Design a binder for this molecule. Structure first.
Ligand SMILES: CCCCCCCCCCCC(=O)O
Length: 103
């Protein structure tokens, strides 16, 4: 393998359903992209409190959002890890979430 990425890159629709899920996301979670496409990111990867906040953010973003950053605790194969997500529309029906593990 020539190189590796440094970010967890997840693309979502307005419902939080997953459209793409990169290799580092697979490494953190133990789940393959093919296993998670169409699945809901909030219920799959967040505690109830984080999911509720995150779902409201995404729904609000699709209404009138500008690109933004947020910190989210995420359930991984070694417990919860904190990520900075840089979120923006595709250059709109999909949201690109560009995450760094900031734990
Ligand atoms: C480790 C990969 C799995 C986590 C992907 C989560 C997507 C984050 C969406 C955050 C939106 C928000 O809370 O404002």
């Amino acid at each position: 393998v020539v190189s590796e990425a440094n970010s967890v890159i997840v693309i979502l629709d307005r419902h939080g359903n997953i459209q793409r899920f990169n290799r580092l996301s697979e490494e953190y979670t133990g789940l393959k992209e093919q296993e998670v496409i169409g699945q809901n990111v909030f219920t799959l990867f967040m505690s109830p409190a984080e999911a509720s906040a995150s779902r409201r953010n995404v729904t609000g973003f699709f209404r009138n959002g500008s690109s933004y950053e947020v910190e989210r605790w995420i359930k991984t194969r070694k417990g919860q890890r904190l990520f900075l997500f840089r979120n923006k529309f595709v250059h709109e029906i999909f949201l690109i979430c560009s995450g760094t593990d900031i734990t």
